[PDB]
Ligand binder design. Structure first.
Ligand SMILES: CC(C)(C)[C@H](NC(=O)C(F)(F)F)C(=O)N1C[C@H]2[C@@H]([C@H]1C(=O)N[C@H](C=N)C[C@@H]1CCNC1=O)C2(C)C
Ligand SMILES: CC(C)(C)[C@H](NC(=O)C(F)(F)F)C(=O)N1C[C@H]2[C@@H]([C@H]1C(=O)N[C@H](C=N)C[C@@H]1CCNC1=O)C2(C)C
Lengths: 305, 305
């Protein structure tokens, strides 16, 4: 028993992190086979970042201008190209620690682990969710760009996020590994803000199932509800609509606990309308929305990789 | 910016986890150089665990009765001994992935990362604190014993916890790597409970400094307090006394933010006496006590390993 915000083991990703330096700008790169992926603003001075022309800055660089370091070994760069907001540095050595991997673009509400890195070295790992407004609530300082977010399926690392920048409220924005930003953001130092965020309803329900599994049951009420009546209530409280797809994804937890999804929705509806009356669920005074149904099943069933 | 519950990168520990099987009991072991460490109740049947005589159970085992598996390779056991509540299996192969390491016994209030494992394979990583009552608020299922807790200092892994059992309330108990339990617990399946827990005051203060660093400043008041008057108030709310040692350890954060430790104590004293009036600090409605001062400095200054 017990329920914790849990990250994937980071070793497979740790063996891929490198330092990339251009001029005096240094950040992190991801070394897979013979390619290093990193944010394109490695090629900017601080002044360039206010309004950069990346294509123009890159034209003036050659391979030897990129200093890539894997531990104490410098990797010789033998080609370079830009793909959207990421640079790809071809190097003359394949990373022998390359895991089986894929590049994926995740959807809002999905979670992933972040390996926060500085100067190519890992600092910590934490679990994040892609918010409905396409930001993540991360923890990042200067030099953290190029840190990546990932999921693991058995032996395969699915890379889904590379870190580029911090927005007002101290939230974070980045790209998939093809360099396309999540959300309507650009890699330029000019005022930008995220839209209003919303609560990931399907994840709250998953977390309520985790609570029941752990014996935290006080919030269960005697009632059911229709999907449409639940969604009318949730809307007022800035909760995402619950779709039939979400209901299906909640099936395994519903079947395991013996609580129909719409019955749990009736319990959540009461929690939203009445509040928690000074009580906690799994130790939390606020409803938690950064566990997916899959996260709950994995943690309560001990899936390994 | 941003502040997250952050674990150490787990790769160094991942390369040490193995499966240990005796009869039909299977759990996790830690393979360092040519020794595998694991909880001694691997040698018990389910019936043995109700009231085991470990010395007697071990006398009837020989080396070949222990099946140790590292990935797809079986490790030949060539010796065995018991040290308090842990078994040490000498094997004929040194682990080539052994990191620089030390065994440490941590104190209540200190934090560490847990690599939760099943069948010798890592499932997830999360950050824990040794509670004042010598339990940890973990997440563990059947087969998780032998999962270890650790800190990392540059390149050195300090192993501090090995998991053995779950207590009422769904909290967890275990040993250091010399097999000595934290707290007054024994590895026998009989009713045991932890003492009343208390709040780690020095860690709450560290977390309040993290809040200020991130611009969450509403709780700062105009007042100071003496150490003794603060400790009288904290006592009523089941907070650990704050010692001069704790004040000194808070020095770096105090100096960085320009807020004297006793002034932050005056702010905490008001929070305890008046509550949070429906506000949050770093997104939390409850005061958080599982970040040490060192954790805060590391996360807000990006120390790497
Ligand atoms: C926060 C700042 C005001 C500095 C700026 N943000 C905005 O200008 C915004 F308003 F658009 F968001 C911003 O992040 N950058 C400005 C410049 C890069 C990016 C940046 O410094 N990236 C860092 C990479 N190592 C990670 C950062 C550092 C602090 N915490 C992080 O996560 C580029 C967009 C090219
Ligand atoms: C919780 C249970 C009632 C089963 C029992 N507890 C008490 O009897 C107590 F009351 F003393 F705590 C207990 O944990 N054990 C009984 C038996 C071992 C230990 C045990 O099964 N260890 C597991 C190792 N893989 C990890 C566990 C599994 C569930 N979650 C965990 O963390 C030993 C003490 C020798």
């Amino acid at each position: 028993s017990g329920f914790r915000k849990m990250a994937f083991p980071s070793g497979k990703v740790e063996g891929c992190m490198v330092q990339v330096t251009c001029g005096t700008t240094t950040l992190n790169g991801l070394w897979l086979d013979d390619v290093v992926y990193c944010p394109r603003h490695v090629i900017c001075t601080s002044e360039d970042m206010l309004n950069p022309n990346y294509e123009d800055l890159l034209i003036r660089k050659s391979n030897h201008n990129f200093l890539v370091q894997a531990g104490n070994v410098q990797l010789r760069v033998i080609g370079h190209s830009m793909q959207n907001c990421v640079l790809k540095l071809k190097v003359d050595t394949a990373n022998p620690k390359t895991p089986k991997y894929k590049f994926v673009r995740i959807q809002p509400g999905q979670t992933f682990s972040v390996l926060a890195c500085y100067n190519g070295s890992p600092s910590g790992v934490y679990q994040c969710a892609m918010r409905p407004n396409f930001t993540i609530k991360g923890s990042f300082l200067n030099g953290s760009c190029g840190s990546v977010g990932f999921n693991i399926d058995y032996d395969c690392v699915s890379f889904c996020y590379m870190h580029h920048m911090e927005l007002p409220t101290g939230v974070h924005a980045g790209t998939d590994l093809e360099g396309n930003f999540y959300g309507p953001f650009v890699d330029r130092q000019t005022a930008q803000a995220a839209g209003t965020d919303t609560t990931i309803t399907v994840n709250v329900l998953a977390w309520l199932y985790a609570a029941v599994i752990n014996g935290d049951r006080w919030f269960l009420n005697r009632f059911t509800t229709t999907l449409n009546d639940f969604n009318l209530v949730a809307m007022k409280y800035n909760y995402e609509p619950l779709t039939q797809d979400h209901v299906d994804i909640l099936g395994p937890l519903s079947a395991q606990t013996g609580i129909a999804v719409l019955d749990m929705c009736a319990s959540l509806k009461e929690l939203l309308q009445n509040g928690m009356n000074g009580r906690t669920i799994l130790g939390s005074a606020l409803l938690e929305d950064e566990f997916t149904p899959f996260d709950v099943v994995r943690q309560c069933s001990g899936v390994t990789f």
